[PDB]
Design a binder for this molecule. Structure first.
Ligand code: CLA
Ligand code: CLA
Ligand code: CLA
Ligand code: CLA
Ligand code: CLA
Ligand code: CLA
Ligand code: CLA
Ligand code: CLA
Ligand code: LHG
Ligand code: BCR
Ligand code: SF4
Ligand code: SF4
Ligand code: SF4
Lengths: 165, 75, 61, 39, 738, 144, 80, 75
């Protein structure tokens, strides 16, 4: 398919690796009882192994010569061959939660600078104000692009600068 | 034009890490050589001076020579 | 220059609080070279929060 | 009790409680959704 | 007049000061302005001398602190017993000690970490533990998980009692200074009651519980079938069935016919051959003797009656012509300065831990311990490290005394003064002897490396070329082995197999055999002497020049912990005694790493192994390979690192992960050790600018770490990295080849 | 105030003798001699290590470098409220008085002192190092 | 000898003088500040360059500056 | 060269030899650039040009180098 990679459900080293992990787990399994808790834990392990290999073969991942899933990081090639779930949807999910954390921290900083003890509200966290901003932070991309377009996202050149500049 | 794979991906990323980081120390040493906010008159001591003493919280390896020195390790 | 308690902006370039805002304590009326006493709510690397400045190093902003 | 809540509002206690919540949330998600790599 | 003295209700129990960080320090109670404050808050949290000048308040603080420590340790012991009862294979191990691996930790089945639960035997899965608790519990006579559970509850109750005792003796009834200064009474009570009654009550438990249960366990009867300990106390007929002495009761004790107690108070020596541990009858006699000795020792100092010695009088009585006033003033020093006491107690406590390591490897006191090679390596290594750290601490607090508490107008022409007054001679001689030791010890290795590389093995220092035999140690060994025949007539065997003699094996494994000392042993012992002498040089120089030197004449006014006195006079970085502790820490790591490497390789090469002759774990390569650095590099590190580097995909994979992680942390320390805070402060300036541009600059100002904190972080990550590396190497190696 | 003279026949403090005293610098180059007058007999701390008893009256010690005499001066001045003065002595026998060189201690203003090494400008008003290239030596821009 | 300079931002707080371990600095009459005092460095031949004066100076930036220069036996702090 | 790339030790030695030479020479380039800033740079001769404007946005430069170094290192 992409880059000479076969799909994992078509790959043979993928099936060999699945069979090898089952072989190691059953060689460890064959030295216990039946209803014993080590045997129960190893059968749960084998169930999770089979479920994991079936889910990775179901998700349409691409395997190499080693039988291991390879990820495709190109928006157009991923959206063309059905691989947006591995890099593209995770990167927009990450950027949503990372801007969430950063915007809630920025709103807490701006809220606590407007008092007579900003360092005291930085050492001892104002929990109601922090939870208020943490719930209100869900509209952070809209609020961020609005603060961008008003010219209030950015401080002017009243910043601290060195002698050189 | 050797065949490349995910190991080659990870190592070229580590290479970019090393290049950007060494460039960070060297560019910081070049541009903070005239002076910084910790030491505004760094040009008056020259290129390779030891320090400016334990005052102002202590200033160890503050010189541009010392920034070079820290960047030879990253090289 | 500026009166007591008013806010100024520091333009001495090698100051720690250059391009930032402090508060005037007093202005000495002798022939002293740096009469404007300004306090800053943050400390420098020496842990000092107060410095003398000149008339052309402070701007009432 | 007010002073005990101020002590619980101090920084390392809130870092401990919040990282316990975040780590437990990720642990719970990795238990009920075992081994996620995609989507 | 020795009496109880206490102030009523000094400090109110309130949550107010919990809500005010840094309340204890007048400087730090102002609040935070830069980030440095936080670090200061944690660094000076327990430096009670910098809080108050009042010795009474300081003494009370340290007393309740000690109670807190004891409560924490009791929580820890409670945890170990509870995990040994609920999450272990202890009973199965009791039923088959030679083929079941001790395990008392299990992991949950999430994110694949379940693989760490390996096949330890007994129908159990977990991580093999190497603390030696199973052998301790079998030696104590514990047979069921229920007894361990009850011990866990007991230890938790005792932890609650210790934390109540802390709160009580700080907030409700806090002892006075003249209570704390009753050192004669304190020595009497600790030598009698603690050591004396401790070993007496333990000998009681041994004689009454340990001996019969372990005698039956060595006889072979099933643990569940063995009578419970309370039945042994209740029905003395069973005790008379195993040891007929108990039939006569306590009549031979009071009538002084003690010879009839020879059934359980013995002097056999050696090891129990079916069990590989010291005879519990020998251990019982030993604890009875120790008990009587310490109870005699605890009645030496005068308290509320005329009889008894006086510490100041014994000190002031020993004066000679060479030393002048002699030990005058030392009583005053050791009853007013906590740091001096802490220095002495740390030195002897560390040394004692190292002696514990050696005597416990050499004379295995617990059953099925000597053949649990992982437990032996772990215990020796652990207690050696603890020892070394406490010695460095001793040097640290000695220097802290020298700077803060030393006052020469009560200390004028004294032992301490003369030491201070000829410190240049002391340090110069120590300097020379360190260089001498370094040259000849390390130079033999470099010489051997060169000769071996040049194809001239006949010119090396080895057992077949130019021999350097440890004649003195061999003579002491031979004397020790021949001692039972002449100089200790009542001894059936030597105190340890390593002196010479036969061979005790358990389950096909070698418990202990005679250790032979040759040229390689000569060379490593002189390496040890060298490294120890250098560590002593650094620490002793630190304490002798803590106050002044020709470079810094007024160093005392700068404190114990300070970065320097500026780049002038050529440069004065690391002139403080704290910095001498910092370097001594690195040198202590060096020394003890070579010590534990010596132990590991020597045991695996010349002692341990299976009995068919004995096939050793590394075939006996020590005597020929341990003379070159290339030999240590190839036959020890490279060869034995196989197990750790190929531990992936098994239960030992965590040791590979911690191998890599420890290498990483060690390397991560080098950034702090090799760099300086000026660069980092300027970098932080640029980053602060970036945060200012986006209105996210914090009100607490980001500062680079202090010079001394950079050094502290450096040495801490350095030690953690290196020590954890050797930990993972050792454990993976000895568990896979054990 | 006039410049005092060194009396070499001044009794020394009671001291058993350290290994941290003088060296060949005292015989070849220079050594310094510190002199004070005490009010009572009292134990102090020697800057080279150890304890010593000062006498009641004139005292006399001799040190290698200058910072040792400053350290003993600071100790005797802040702890005992004494007024010492220490000199510079050469193997020729040349005796150079100093501290207090004016007779009044330098931590307070005295009329008659000439100000030396005073740049009458800010530190930010110094020139760039390009303006002081190719003089007879290495120069800093603050030298001019 | 080390180059020690005094700048006109001095407020005559005497902190540098009481911080120098060598008696190099002293206070002179002046009119530029309210204290009517200025520091001065007439004995820089005995200066070792420890920079205690610079640590003690309160002004921002420094009014006393130590430029490490050519070394002698006095500036290296040698007792031998 | 003829029968290079069949001498594998020659291949590895020459590659590693010119790569370490290149790294030292790049560090020296940035070192002598910092020496240029301290000794030779006249600001009045360069009032407004590209070399002065680099000193004007040096904080943005070091900030974005710090960002790319931290990003590549973490990931
Ligand atoms: C980070 C840099 C980067 C690089 C090196 C690539 C590389 C590639 N892109 Mg991708 N792409 C990227 C980021 C990048 N992309 C981003 C951020 C987006 C969202 C704006 C896209 C959206 C996208 C689409 C819709 C498509 C590609 C395609 C491609 C492949 C061929 C095009 C090419 O050679 O242009 C060099 C790349 C750049 C100069 C970077 C800018 C990318 C622009 C914005 C889009 C280029 C699309 C191109 C005009 C379509 C060519 C069609 C092709 C059949 C000839 C090539 C592997 C095409 C493909 O699927 O090939 C099989 C394709 O259809 N890309
Ligand atoms: C920094 C690089 C990096 C990246 C990109 C990942 C990514 C991942 N790791 Mg790895 N890992 C890392 C570092 C990293 N890890 C490190 C440093 C360690 C050692 C501590 C590990 C040890 C580790 C283990 C043991 C496991 C993972 C697993 C995973 C997968 C977790 C998916 C998940 O949590 O469910 C999805 C999570 C969420 C949906 C929570 C987000 C909640 C928000 C609201 C969602 C919003 C979306 C819109 C994911 C692919 C798991 C796996 O199975 O890999 C295939 C797994 O078992 N990691
Ligand atoms: C590990 C053993 C240990 C012990 C016995 C102590 C003991 C103490 N600490 Mg210390 N502390 C420790 C470790 C320890 N600490 C560590 C590892 C740190 C981080 C470096 C600190 C950081 C720290 C700070 C910042 C402070 C203390 C303080 C104290 C004292 C007051 C404690 C108290 O009143 O609460 C009583 C304890 C309980 C009622 C039970 C504990 C329950 C909590 C919530 C858990 C007490 C002597 C305080 C002090 O010294 O005041 C002068 C103080 O301000 N500690
Ligand atoms: C013979 C009685 C006796 C005993 C057994 C002890 C035992 C101890 N004291 Mg000592 N002490 C005593 C008398 C005694 N003391 C007297 C008379 C004085 C005044 C001169 C002191 C003054 C003193 C100070 C200042 C300190 C100690 C400390 C200690 C502990 C050292 C830690 C350790 O390694 O123990 C191993 C641990 C154990 C054996 C745990 C068992 C401990 C329990 C409480 C039994 C000990 C008996 C105890 C005295 C009874 C208290 C009853 C109470 C309800 C009134 C140890 C528990 C140090 C300490 O740690 O404080 C907490 C400490 O700082 N003691
Ligand atoms: C130090 C710890 C220790 C303890 C606790 C014991 C305890 C015991 N040993 Mg001993 N033993 C020890 C060390 C110890 N031993 C050592 C070191 C040796 C070697 C010399 C021996 C050698 C030895 C032999 C050979 C024998 C014992 C025996 C005994 C048992 C009876 C002894 C006796 O009659 O005491 C005297 C009685 C007392 C001390 C009475 C206790 C006081 C009572 C409880 C006070 C109650 C007062 C209160 C108000 C009333 C309760 C009211 C309440 C209900 C409300 C007893 C369990 C005998 C035995 O039974 O073997 C199985 C026995 O034959 N031991
Ligand atoms: C390989 C690593 C290494 C080596 C070789 C050294 C060597 C030394 N350290 Mg150092 N140290 C080290 C790491 C090392 N250190 C590190 C990493 C730290 C940071 C924590 C320190 C911090 C430190 C402290 C705090 C101290 C030392 C001291 C010493 C000296 C000990 C005196 C001695 O044994 O002389 C014998 C010489 C040797 C053992 C070196 C090898 C000599 C070879 C075998 C023979 C030389 C002959 C040669 C081949 C001929 C060359 C001819 C050629 C030029 C033509 C010794 C020179 C101590 C000191 O100087 O006090 C005495 C001291 O106090 N070091
Ligand atoms: C550092 C410790 C050390 C020691 C003890 C030795 C010892 C030796 N080397 Mg080796 N060597 C070393 C380090 C050492 N080496 C190192 C680091 C290297 C690498 C550079 C070498 C490389 C090397 C080579 C290539 C060779 C040797 C050889 C030898 C042997 C002959 C040397 C000789 O003839 O010198 C002459 C002897 C002296 C100069 C004696 C001077 C020292 C005296 C005895 C001190 C006495 C002090 C006294 C007690 C003070 C009393 C005072 C009182 C009177 C007042 C000898 C066994 C040779 C050999 O083949 O050996 C078999 C040889 O070919 N070595
Ligand atoms: C393995 C060793 C090691 C590592 C990992 C680093 C990492 C770093 N160096 Mg350093 N450095 C090192 C050795 C190392 N250095 C040595 C030997 C020297 C010679 C003195 C230097 C000298 C040096 C200079 C001059 C500079 C750096 C800089 C950096 C940072 C560059 C940006 C980056 O990639 O960060 C990525 C972040 C990491 C690699 C850190 C990992 C983060 C951990 C995994 C997160 C926490 C994990 C876990 C929760 C921890 C729990 C533990 C608990 C007890 C708290 C980075 C943190 C630059 C810098 O600081 O720029 C901002 C910089 O200018 N270094
Ligand atoms: C031999 C040392 C005898 C030491 C000895 O016998 O001293 C004995 C001597 C006896 O003094 P007095 O009899 O006057 O002491 C009276 C009281 O102060 C002590 O009760 O003590 C001294 O004079 C101090 C001299 C120290 C000299 C230091 C030499 C250090 C050599 C270090 C070498 C050690 C190698 C072996 C280590 C295991
Ligand atoms: C891809 C390709 C191409 C293109 C290419 C290019 C365009 C390239 C470029 C490249 C580049 C573009 C590079 C660059 C580099 C740079 C560097 C390497 C730099 C360095 C720098 C420095 C080192 C600096 C220094 C200094 C300082 C710091 C100060 C001032 C002075 C001075 C300047 C000296 C072609 C089409 C042909 C072909 C196809 C492929
Ligand atoms: S320690 Fe750091 S600061 Fe103090 S002198 Fe040495 S280098 Fe300069
Ligand atoms: S220089 Fe700085 S320190 Fe010395 S006097 Fe003038 S102000 Fe006070
Ligand atoms: S550096 Fe040392 S000597 Fe020179 S002035 Fe500052 S303090 Fe006095």
């Amino acid at each position: 398919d992409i880059a000479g990679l076969t799909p994992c459900s078509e790959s043979k080293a993928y099936a060999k690796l699945e069979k090898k992990e089952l072989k190691t787990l059953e060689k460890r399994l064959k030295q216990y009882e039946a209803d014993s808790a080590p045997a129960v834990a190893l059968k749960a392990t084998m169930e999770r192994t089979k479920a994991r290999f079936a889910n990775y073969a179901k998700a349409g991942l691409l395997c190499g010569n080693d039988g291991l899933p390879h990820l495709i990081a190109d928006p157009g090639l991923a959206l063309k061959y059905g691989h947006a779930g591995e890099v593209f949807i995770p990167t927009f999910g990450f950027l949503y939660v990372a801007g969430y954390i950063g915007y809630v921290g920025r709103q807490y900083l701006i809220a606590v600078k407007g008092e007579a003890k900003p360092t005291d509200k930085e050492i001892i966290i104002d929990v109601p104000l922090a939870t208020k901003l943490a719930w209100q932070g869900a509209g952070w991309p809209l609020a961020a692009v609005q603060e961008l377009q008003r010219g209030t996202l950015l401080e002017k050149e009243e910043n601290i600068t060195v002698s050189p500049r | 034009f050797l065949t490349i794979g995910p190991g080659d991906f990870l190592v070229h990323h580590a290479i970019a890490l090393g290049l950007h980081t060494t460039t960070l120390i060297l560019v910081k040493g070049a541009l903070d050589a005239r002076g910084s906010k910790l030491m505004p008159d760094k040009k008056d001591f020259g290129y390779s001076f030891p320090c400016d003493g334990p005052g102002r919280g202590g200033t160890c390896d503050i010189s541009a020579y010392d920034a070079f020195y820290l960047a030879v390790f990253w090289m | 220059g500026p009166k007591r308690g008013s806010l100024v902006k520091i333009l001495r370039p090698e100051s720690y609080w250059f391009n930032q805002v402090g508060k005037v304590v007093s202005v000495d009326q002798s022939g002293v070279r740096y009469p404007v006493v300004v306090r800053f709510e943050n400390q420098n690397y020496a842990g000092v929060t107060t410095n003398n400045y000149a008339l052309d190093e402070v701007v009432a902003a | 009790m007010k002073d005990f809540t101020t002590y619980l509002s101090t920084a390392p206690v809130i870092a401990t409680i919040w990282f316990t919540f975040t780590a437990g949330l990720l642990i719970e998600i990795n238990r009920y959704f075992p081994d996620p790599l995609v989507f | 007049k020795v009496k109880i003295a206490v102030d009523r209700n000094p400090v109110e129990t309130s949550f107010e000061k919990w809500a005010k960080p840094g309340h204890f320090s007048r400087t730090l109670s102002k609040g935070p302005n830069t980030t440095t404050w936080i670090w200061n808050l944690h660094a000076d949290a327990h430096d009670f001398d910098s809080h108050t000048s009042d010795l009474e308040e300081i003494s009370r603080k340290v007393f309740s602190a000690h109670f807190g420590q004891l409560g924490i340790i009791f929580i820890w012991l409670s945890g170990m017993y509870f995990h040994g009862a609920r999450f272990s294979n202890y009973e199965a191990w009791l039923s088959d000690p030679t083929h079941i691996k001790p395990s008392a930790q299990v992991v949950w089945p999430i994110v694949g970490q379940e693989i760490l639960n390996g096949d330890v035997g007994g129908g159990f899965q977990g991580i093999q533990i190497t603390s030696g608790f199973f052998q301790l519990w079998r030696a104590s006579g514990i047979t069921s998980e229920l007894q361990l559970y009850t011990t866990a509850i007991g230890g938790l109750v005792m932890a609650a009692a210790m934390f109540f005792a802390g709160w009580f003796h700080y907030h409700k009834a806090a002892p006075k200074l003249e209570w704390f200064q009753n050192v004669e009474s304190m020595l009497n009570h600790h030598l009698g009651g603690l050591l004396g009654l401790g070993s007496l009550a333990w000998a009681g438990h041994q004689i009454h519980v340990s001996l019969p249960v372990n005698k039956l366990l060595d006889a072979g009867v099933d643990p569940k079938e063995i009578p419970l300990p309370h039945d042994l106390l209740l029905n003395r007929a069973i005790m008379a069935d195993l040891y007929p002495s108990f039939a006569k009761g306590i009549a031979p004790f009071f009538t002084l016919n003690w010879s009839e107690y020879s059934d359980f108070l013995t002097f056999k020596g050696g090891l129990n051959p079916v069990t590989g541990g010291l005879w519990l009858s020998d251990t019982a006699h030993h604890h009875v003797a120790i008990a009587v000795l310490f109870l005699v020792a605890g009645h030496m100092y005068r308290t509320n009656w005329g009889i008894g010695h006086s510490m100041k009088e014994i000190l002031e009585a020993h004066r000679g012509p060479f030393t002048g006033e002699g030990h005058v003033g030392l009583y005053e020093i050791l009853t007013t300065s906590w740091h001096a006491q802490l220095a002495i107690n740390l030195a002897l406590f560390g040394s004692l831990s190292i002696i514990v390591a050696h005597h416990m490897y050499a004379m295995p006191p617990y059953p099925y311990l000597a053949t649990d090679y992982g437990t032996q390596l772990s215990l020796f290594t652990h207690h050696t490290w603890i020892g070394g750290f406490c010695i460095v601490g001793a040097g640290a607090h000695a220097a802290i005394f020298m700077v803060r508490d030393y006052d020469p107008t009560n200390n004028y022409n004294n032992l301490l003064d003369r030491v201070i007054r000829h410190r240049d001679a002391i340090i110069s001689h120590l300097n020379w002897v360190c260089i001498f030791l370094g040259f000849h010890s390390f130079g033999l290795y470099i010489h051997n490396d060169t000769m071996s590389a040049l194809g001239r093995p006949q010119d090396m220092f080895s057992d077949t070329a130019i021999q350097l035999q440890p004649v003195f140690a061999q003579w002491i060994q031979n004397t020790h082995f021949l001692a039972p025949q002449l100089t200790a007539p009542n001894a059936l065997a030597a105190t340890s197999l390593t002196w010479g003699g036969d061979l005790v094996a358990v389950g096909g494994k070698v418990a202990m055999m005679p250790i032979s000392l040759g040229t390689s042993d000569f060379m490593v012992h002189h390496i040890h002497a060298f490294t120890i002498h250098v560590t002593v040089l650094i620490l002793l120089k630190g304490v002798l020049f803590a106050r002044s030197s020709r470079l810094i004449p007024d160093k005392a006014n700068l404190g114990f912990r300070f970065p320097c006195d500026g780049p002038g006079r050529g440069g004065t970085c690391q002139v403080s005694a704290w910095d001498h502790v910092f370097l001594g820490l690195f040198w202590m790591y060096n020394s003890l790493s070579i010590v534990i490497f010596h132990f590991s390789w020597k045991m695996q090469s010349d002692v341990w192994g299976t009995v068919t002759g004995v096939s050793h774990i590394t075939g006996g390569n020590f005597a020929q390979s341990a003379n070159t650095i290339n030999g240590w590099l190839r036959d020890f590190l490279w060869a034995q690192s196989s197990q750790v580097i190929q531990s992936y995909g098994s239960a030992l994979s965590a040791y590979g992960l911690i191998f890599l992680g420890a290498h990483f942390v060690w390397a991560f320390s080098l950034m702090f050790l090799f760099s300086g805070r000026g660069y980092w402060q300027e970098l932080i300036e640029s980053i602060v600018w970036a945060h200012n541009k986006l209105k996210v600059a914090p009100a607490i100002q980001p500062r680079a770490l202090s010079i001394t904190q950079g050094r502290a972080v450096g040495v801490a990550h350095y030690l953690l990295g290196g020590i954890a590396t050797t930990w993972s190497f050792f454990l993976a190696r000895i568990i896979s080849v054990g | 105030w006039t410049v005092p003279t060194l009396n070499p026949d001044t009794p020394s403090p009671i001291f058993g003798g350290s290994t941290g005293g003088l060296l060949r610098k005292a015989q070849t180059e220079e050594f310094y001699v510190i002199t004070w007058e005490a009010k009572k007999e009292q134990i102090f701390e020697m800057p080279t290590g150890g304890a010593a008893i000062m006498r009641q009256g004139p005292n006399l010690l001799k040190f290698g470098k200058k910072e040792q005499c400053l350290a003993l001066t600071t100790q005797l001045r802040n702890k005992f409220k004494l007024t010492p003065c220490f000199y510079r002595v050469f193997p020729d026998g040349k005796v150079q008085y100093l501290h207090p060189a004016d007779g009044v201690y330098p931590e307070k203003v005295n009329a008659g002192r000439v100000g030396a090494n005073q740049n009458m400008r800010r530190i930010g008003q110094n020139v760039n190092p390009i303006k002081v290239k190719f003089s007879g030596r290495m120069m800093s821009p603050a030298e001019i | 000898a080390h180059i020690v300079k005094i700048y006109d931002t001095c407020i005559g707080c005497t902190q540098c003088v009481r911080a120098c371990p060598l008696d190099v600095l002293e206070m002179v009459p002046w009119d530029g500040c309210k204290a009517s005092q200025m520091a001065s460095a007439p004995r820089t031949e005995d200066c070792v360059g420890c920079k205690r004066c610079e640590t003690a100076c309160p002004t921002d930036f420094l009014s006393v500056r130590v430029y490490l220069g050519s070394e002698s036996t006095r500036s290296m702090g040698l007792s031998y | 060269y003829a029968f290079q790339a069949i001498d594998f030790t020659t291949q590895a030695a020459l590659y590693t030899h010119h790569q370490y030479i290149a790294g030292f020479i790049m560090c020296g380039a940035f070192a002598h650039g910092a020496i240029f800033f301290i000794r030779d740079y006249d600001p009045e001769q360069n009032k407004g040009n590209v070399l002065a404007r680099m000193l004007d946005h040096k904080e943005a430069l070091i900030s974005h180098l710090s960002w790319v170094s931290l990003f590549l290192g973490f990931h």
